[model samples]
Target chain A: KKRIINAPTLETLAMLKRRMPSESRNRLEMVRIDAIGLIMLPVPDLYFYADQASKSAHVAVSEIFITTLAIFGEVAAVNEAMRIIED
Target chain B: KKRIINAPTLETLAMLKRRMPSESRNRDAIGLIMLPVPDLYFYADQASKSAHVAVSEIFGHITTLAIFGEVAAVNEAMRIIED
Candidate 1:
């Protein structure tokens, strides 16, 4: 897989958030987004196959590209992290 | 076993500070960390091991592995759920 999926500890998740986008990452929002298992990437420019996939009620390969799409969604955050050496 | 895991909830244990890497001040810091639990993955990771192997546990897992995340936004968000 192109993405490196990690279940790093919350410290890691928080640390990793430094690389995340500058806006805001909230708890209830995270819980809500996560309530539903699927994170849909509607934008075609990011992923090669997002648009072409057919939609089905089932969680199939076509509709659901198995990646968390979290990385793709958070490019800005990572870029921010890349530069954050910390004080 | 291999790694030290965070407590695993409300930032999912919030443990796991790297040694070689610089120390982290916060777990559920200014921003936030997230994981999609689905339903069962929400409480804890479950498996169908064997009869000797139980469905639940005393402490928890021998090891924990959580996944499913990504960078997000271009959208603000939705908090409360509607029935």
Candidate 2:
């Protein structure tokens, strides 16, 4: 499943950051942070999609919660990454 | 997005608890735990049989199991899942 949070509330982003592991938090901290794209897959190989998404657009990808993946950047960048992930 | 921790340590559970909202903290009908599971149907069934917790799912598309109950029951159910 995938969803995009356009102009997410500060609290929402804070909660997402707090729920993420340390390594993921590090990546999230380096992003532009204008929007967030959430994605969940049945497999653990999310790195492949993350890498492809990043390569296709100016977005930062990181892990969220137990297994959800997040893409962070400007709205257009996030949308492009989401499209890459969808394809 | 789907995985299971066979034997999550106390630290893991503590971390999860800390990440939860204050409203979901331990109490009668308040304690809540959300976990990613490879098989939600099987784990939810097992959790139901193991403790007095209410089992539910999050986001329909994700295989995440959410359990709620009193503090002790929720903890017991979570332990059972780890076991």
Candidate 3:
């Protein structure tokens, strides 16, 4: 499942962020809110796309469960990051 | 993604436990653990025998076991599977 929440509420973001591991939560803390990107792939090699997303946009990328990746940042930045992943 | 750790460290289990949603965490604190497809049954059986946890396998392409019970029971069950 891959999708972007364009304008996530604080409550929603809090719930989503809580499911992230500590390492990912640390990076999530550095981002300025507004949007969130979620990616759940069967592949544990999500780090590759995570790196690409971070490089392509001003987003904080987090890897969870070795299979899922979460990107948080402004709307445009997150959209761009997802674009990179989808491309 | 499909390999099992013979004996997972306390810290590793704690980190994995944190990934559970708050809803699950509230009911006496649930713990989430993943295992390779083949290892699921043996570990699940062992965990149930060792602790008072309610084990429910979250069926999916990824085999995750969701253990529900008191915080201590959940933790104990997870530890049991490490053997």
DockQ, per model, reads: 0.03, 0.04, 0.03
lDDT for position A84 in model 3: 69
CAPRI classification of candidate 1: incorrect
lDDT of 3 by residue, B7-55 (tens): 4577765665576444544436656677653244335444445446655
Q: What is the per-residue lDDT of model 1 for residues B2-82, given as tens digits with 9 covering 90 to 100?
A: 122222454443333221123322211111213231221222222121111111111120212222222121011101000
2 or 3, greater by DockQ: 2
Give candidate 2 misplaced runs (Cα > 4 Å).
A54-57, B1-19, B22-83
User: What is the per-residue lDDT of model 3 for residues A1-87, given as tens digits with 9 covering 90 to 100?
Assistant: 466765655445554455567667667667786777776655545878777766755688866443667788899987777776776
- The interface RMSD values of the models, given in order, are 11.1, 11.0, 12.9
Clashing pairs in 2: none
- Which TM-score value belongs to model 2? 0.50
Residue B23, candidate 1: alpha-carbon lDDT: 33
CA lDDT, candidate 1, residue B42: 22
Best by TM-score: 2
Could you give the C-alpha RMSD of every candidate to the true structure, in order shown? 17.8, 10.9, 11.9
- Identify the runs in model 1 with alpha carbons over 4 angstroms from their true place: A4-8, A27-29, A32-44, A47-87, B1-83
